[PDB]
Amino acid sequence: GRYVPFHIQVPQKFFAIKNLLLLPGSYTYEWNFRKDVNMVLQSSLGNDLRVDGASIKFDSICLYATFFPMAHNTASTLEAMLRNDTNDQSFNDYLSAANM
Amino acid sequence: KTAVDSITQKKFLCDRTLWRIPFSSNFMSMGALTDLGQNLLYANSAHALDMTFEVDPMDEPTLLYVLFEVFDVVRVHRPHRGVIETVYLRTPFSA
Amino acid sequence: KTAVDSITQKKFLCDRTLWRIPFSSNFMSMGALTDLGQNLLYANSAHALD
Amino acid sequence: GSIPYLDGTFYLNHTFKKVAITFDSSVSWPGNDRLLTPNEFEIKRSVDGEGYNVAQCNMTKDWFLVQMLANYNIGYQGFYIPESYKDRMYSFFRNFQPMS
Amino acid sequence: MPQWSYMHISGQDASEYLSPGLVQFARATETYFSLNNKFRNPTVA
Amino acid sequence: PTHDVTTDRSQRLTLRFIPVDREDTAYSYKARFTLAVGDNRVLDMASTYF
């Protein structure tokens, strides 16, 4: 059907956040989204969808995350160890290049 | 039997790939920080760059996409419950 | 242009498999004898299931 | 014909709705507020609005998660396409056919 | 160089710059809660 | 292991979040989630999804 009420699951793709182990605390997670049909959609013929009638309206959005059911003493020792200066976490990009 | 005289036409196709020129003396992947990458002449000195590409002519504009392979690293420190500091490094080409 | 108003029907098929609920605390294959398989409550008492 | 009890050709897996596990009189399993429905594993839901379905079918996230942890132990470090050698003919993903 | 090492680009081995107790803990919990990908291993020609 | 790994303590294996604030323009939209990582809650970010 041309009319589709849809549901879609989308991950975090930025290298630092997506290999991170997040320790106890409260933290803000905020993002900005694209609605432009010529970017968010793909057609086999590449025709302009703004002019030829495709449209999208986003009813709602939900967020999900999975947690380990770890022992509290172990959990405390593992939080303690990663808050130390010598034990900072380290990441790098797979593509790792400047684009021109 | 009735065959004309003929000439031969050769060509090739190569879809999906990126062409790669690694910064190594023998051009081998022997590790990511390369031997030219460790040498002292290059390291303490400044250099300008001039590359010249030949490509085939098109009947509408095109783009040459050059990826400069650099290191793009991040260090992550979380000092207290709810606080987080981040140290970003990109070399060559630092912002 | 003339498209009728529509509803969406979603489904799946899954042939050749059994539904599995392994008996473990965090649902992991950490050992053939599960950790849960060994705890005292199930081992030192009798329990009926429904 | 084929004999599913012997040769393994099961196909009515889809005809289950939800499962409730209860030890003695009111002793819940796994319980301790581990799932959004804590006392029952809900396999499928007709038109979710609460965001509990997944993967473009009507199977739930919680169940999908469970099946991935039981079959391949993937869950905790996130979803990805299971290894080809592990994902055999009788394994879940290999046989998963979402439709809309 | 100094500041490469500080940022672990030209640094030492991951098992060697992490606290031992933590190394030891990571080696016990690897197969069922992977920690290798969290920390850099720099390859050097 | 029957110790020093898992717990029998209360807590959710997976958390659902609904936006605090959403703002929308004619081409774009930003969403706000507040991630409350509790006492002894261990979260690998690779498992995150909208």
Q: What's a concise summary of this model?
A:
This is part of a larger assembly, with 6 copies of chain A. The first copy, chain A, has 100 residues and is α+β, with helices and mostly antiparallel strands. Chain A contains 4 helices and 5 strands; from the N terminus they run H-E-E-H-H-E-H-E-E.
Could you characterize what this model shows?
The structure is cut from a larger assembly and holds six copies of chain A. Chain A has 100 residues and is of the alpha+beta class. Helices cover 23% and strands 25% of the residues of chain A. Chain A is elongated and about 60 Å long. The interface between A and F is large, with 42 and 42 residues. The PDB classes it as viral protein. The entry lists the keywords Antibody, Human Adenovirus C5, gene therapy Viral Protein, viral protein. Cryo-EM reconstruction of a complex of a binding protein and human adenovirus C5 hexon.
Topology of this structure?
The structure is cut from a larger assembly and holds six copies of chain A.
Chain A lengths: L14 H4 L2 E2 L2 E10 L2 H4 L8 H4 L10 E6 L3 H11 L6 E4 L4 E3 L1
Class per helix and strand makeup of chain A: alpha+beta
Strand content of chain A: 25-35%
Distance between the termini of chain A: 41 Å
Biggest interface in this structure? A-F, 42 and 42 residues
Computed over alpha carbons, the radius of gyration of chain A is: 21 Å
Oligomer: part of a larger assembly
Subcellular location (chain C): Virion; Host nucleus
Protein name (chain C): Hexon protein
Organism (chain C): Human adenovirus C serotype 5
Family (chain C): Belongs to the adenoviridae hexon protein family.
